[PDB]
DNA sequence: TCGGATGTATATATCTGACACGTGCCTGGAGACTAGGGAGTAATCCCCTTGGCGGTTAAAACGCGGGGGACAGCGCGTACGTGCGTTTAAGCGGTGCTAGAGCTGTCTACGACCAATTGAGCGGCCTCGGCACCGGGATTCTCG
DNA sequence: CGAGAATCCCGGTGCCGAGGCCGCTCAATTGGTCGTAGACAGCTCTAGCACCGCTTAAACGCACGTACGCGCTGTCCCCCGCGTTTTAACCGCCAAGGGGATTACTCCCTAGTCTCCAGGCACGTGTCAGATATATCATCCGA
């Protein structure tokens, strides 16, 4: 029927960061699998964090802590900084 | 390695000022060279006459950078009929030549796109892209036959007005003309056969090597550097590009330059100053 | 006229490193996969992408094992790779 | 209007939120969690794609293939930690010959 | 016995990409056992997934799940 | 905060297997953690199976497949046999 | 009515009801089948019986009646299939299995 | 009160006893200095996760449960604590 | 007067400390080490005794496993003396440093 | 020291099939409004961690043979790579042909859910027996 | 081979925790309803399997030289075993305070429901990046 994929969004990101580079279909499938796997990892860690504290919500606190736990040092710091900027940007409006 | 070309001498032995500046450059793909903004360099050099070799471009494909410069407005182009993408020469001039012709005798049947002849008031200019002997010397015998044909052709021309021959003559005449002489024992550009051809060219026409005339003992002065192994970075090169002159023009000779710093090809420009 | 033993072997290592090919004949691998899977369940149908995925995983695992074992053999002051080195690498990786 | 545009992202927020509930991770999902996670995901591939093509542009090509992603990930020092266990289909291998093997 | 299908040159070439200059005469016979064991390990889980799904076609994604359970995550097929 | 650990059940199983053998508190803690970890593994694999096959419930077949995936060798064969026997007795 | 627990009904010893409650509260799926807790409890009690039997054999070998973590650690390591099920697990205060490489011994 | 030069507290005989339990017969002198770094790295990796876990719950005491989960993150799965 | 040969005591000890199941590391130095490591992340923490014991036990298990693996590596190289490069090999093959 | 065998940087001429872009439409996302249950805040108390003092001594630190093992060096002979003719099976191109994968249409059984209820299970308290240990003697290894 | 050191065994002692007991739970069980989901039947198109023929890249058996794996020897150096001197760990003891569970209350954030529309996914299509293919030294081996 329909396929749910991140092809469009990864293409948009590639255009934003590299305005003159194309991406083949295979590298597209790899970038989809990467996004799906990272989503699974972080969401599972957030769910486990919520379970441990006898809490029944996945909010920004659980996500940030899971991101800090999974990603290594510089990636963790940059990712949490960018995520906090985005969420403050969203809640402002 | 390194070499620094000495300053431009702009007066003749008898003290007459240079009135004519000729630049010759094997651009090894005219289009690419223009994107390598080789025309910006030409504008800075402001020659009266510009001779180009290995344009690899038929006249219909010339970049609109053609019109960009008003001063060089008289332009003549040649490309091979059956080897598009190879050879190709051009001659661009501030003043209009009296006569222009192409090839060395039978271009109308063997359109090779290697040679342009232009006659001016006081001299005849020939620019050439001499055929390479080829990797493994596969076309050395052709080159030898071509050298003979060319010599005979030029003999005729020089019989009238003085001759200036410029371009890529695809030989390093003597050991001083390349970095690795024995390293190029039988290699294209330094076979005994090609070197002898150059010597016969000087003796038969006759012609003088302008640069070596002025700088007879100067080593490490090259005009071509192999793209591979960053030989340009190391100055591992050869002198393949020349201005050869009739003996009668030597009193008019001010300088013969090698423009080592000008990028955009695996050859650099060479420039001649004459007091006419 | 034969190139010396070091020169041709490393000529091969450099080519086989940059290539990202499959390096294993596909039909023999497909037959091997069918024969092994014949045991667990009878009359199975393998999708082609499944065989390709198995081949990709097999190549990756074998290449990793061969790297880890080259390190093991090199440490023993020897360049020839021996089966003892593979066995040692497998036991250390906790896969035995 | 769209939540992704409101928060200034490129990855979808509605799709991530739908996944966050449908995946049965918790009984309730906060409002800021999808935005935070979409931002993290966008940053991650922004990084992978930024590396991957340099690693493509150095080889005179303009198209990213699995080989360039394998090179970009392996050449990095913490992305390799993140993706140590994963294998990329026909990703080849980093060129690494051990010293003894090179005859001195 | 198609483990004989994994020929000596193919094993040698896998070693070359792994970065091995000299290969003894017993690896060819020894690595086939490792390869066979490795496949058995992934083929069992793939067939179990397919059997549970009540299908009879081992799809590529099932193989992907089978690799993922053992840690050998694979990208490109889903 | 009652903790509801698997102490009584594990003690009953020992008494069943060995009638005259005791068990210390540290061993009780080891058995509690073992049981919790195995339960978590089986439940996680069952949920993953349900999600993979677009299902929405955990029937006994998902548990059977999860057991077959986790337990290696004969352990799987005897675990599934005793589990299906227990289910069969329960239904009737 | 008369009350009979599913743990007794199925003939097991682990509590089916507690497993059922953990399965729902654990957020593994929104629906839980009827037989899933029974099957899971049967598997759990089987595995516990096996490891306890091996531990008791090891303890009786050492002329000790009580089971301490050392006995559980020898029972786990000496068997082969239990060992790969619990390959990446360490037992607190469990010690290590006594094997010394024969090269080291003259 | 801040603490300094504590990695040397893991004395040489302790390393010797650990190596003996591992089953080695003869130890070179440059092993002690290698293991005091290896164990430092391992402890740093575990403590980072434990402190992250305790900080998320807005606590101030590293409960044994936090260390157990930090270990389970790296695939060690300690048994006997909680 | 009577002195044992260079390997006997070494082997008596493998056996005793492979038979017993104590901690093998003094508690206070390890506790101070753990506190020092944890002070670089969050200031003024308050560890529990059970947490320190768990860290101790995990460290002993990890170090014993590493020593067993590097002993195998050293024996493979036709040697009995354990050397640091063997430890580096064991760590590399597992894939921890790299 | 030299003659022959491999990397090898730019530039242009075709083929192609595979990325990149119109497009349309429908399905999932977006906006509004409500209920209510989860979570944050506030106060408390008690128990669990920190710190500090002193005594005891097991364990760590240090020094000194010396002997066994790490390591450098020589030799040898057998296993492996290297090239080459030959055979063999893998691609690759149809070609067909049917198992069955994937989707859709009922609806019946099956599990979520709520009102009682009671008994399996948990917390606090004995209490006697398993077990570590010291005291001593007999047994086994070990190296000169 | 035998004196000496390490180890196992035989047993009384006392200790503390494993196991049983009793009171009090609170959640597991019965008995009903009711919405829905996945069991089951049925249908269509897809792709997986079997076959055949041709090309030729590759696998194979074979010689041959050589280089490196392993064995042996000698040397020296450095780690172990033991004895002597610290010294800091360990046990017990105390006080103290702070923070981690608890209960109560409130409030506000999200699930749910409904309606409306736009963006993104499948589908077609024109264009051109990549794959060759042809021209135009320098350096590193074996001798």
Numbering used by the authors:
A (entry chain H): 32 to 124
B (entry chain K): 43 to 318
C (entry chain A): 39 to 134
D (entry chain G): 15 to 118
E (entry chain B): 24 to 101
F (entry chain D): 32 to 123
G (entry chain C): 12 to 117
H (entry chain F): 20 to 101
Quote the study on this structure.
To obtain mechanistic insight into how APE1 efficiently binds and processes the solvent-exposed AP site at SHL−6, we generated and purified an APE1-AP-NCP−6 substrate complex for structure determination by cryo-EM. A subset of 58,854 particles was used to generate a 3.4 Å cryo-EM reconstruction of the APE1-AP-NCP−6 complex. Interestingly, only the catalytic core of APE1 (residues 43–318) was observed in the APE1-AP-NCP-6 reconstruction despite utilizing full-length APE1 during cryo-EM grid preparation. In the APE1-AP-NCP−6 structure, APE1 is engaged with the nucleosome at the entry/exit site with a ~10 base-pair footprint that spans the nucleosomal DNA between SHL-5.5 to SHL−6.5. Importantly, APE1 only interacts with the nucleosomal DNA and no direct contacts between APE1 and the core histone octamer are observed. APE1 binding induces an additional ~20o bend in the nucleosomal DNA from SHL−5.5 to SHL-6.5 that results from a ~7 Å movement of the nucleosomal DNA away from the histone octamer at SHL-6. The APE1-induced DNA bending facilitates displacement of the AP site from within the nucleosomal DNA helix into the APE1 active site. The void in the DNA helix generated by the extrahelical AP site is filled by R177, which wedges into the major groove of the nucleosomal DNA near SHL−6. The APE1 active site makes additional contacts with the nucleosomal DNA at SHL-6 through intercalating loop residues Y269, M270, and M271, which wedge into the minor groove of the nucleosomal DNA. Importantly, the APE1 side chains that coordinate the nucleophilic water (residues D210 and N212) and catalytic metal (residues D70, E96, and D308) are in position to perform catalysis on the nucleosomal AP site, suggesting our structure represents APE1 in a catalytically competent conformation.
The nucleosome consists of ~147 bp of DNA wrapped around a core octameric histone protein complex, containing two copies each of histone H2A, H2B, H3, and H41. One of the most common forms of DNA damage is the baseless sugar moiety known as apurinic/apyrimidinic (AP) sites, with an estimated ~10,000 AP sites generated in each cell per day. The primary enzyme tasked with locating and processing genomic AP sites is the multifunctional nuclease AP endonuclease 1 (APE1), which is a key component of the base excision repair (BER) pathway. During BER, APE1 functions as an AP-endonuclease by cleaving the DNA phosphodiester backbone 5′ of the AP site generating a 5′-nicked BER intermediate.
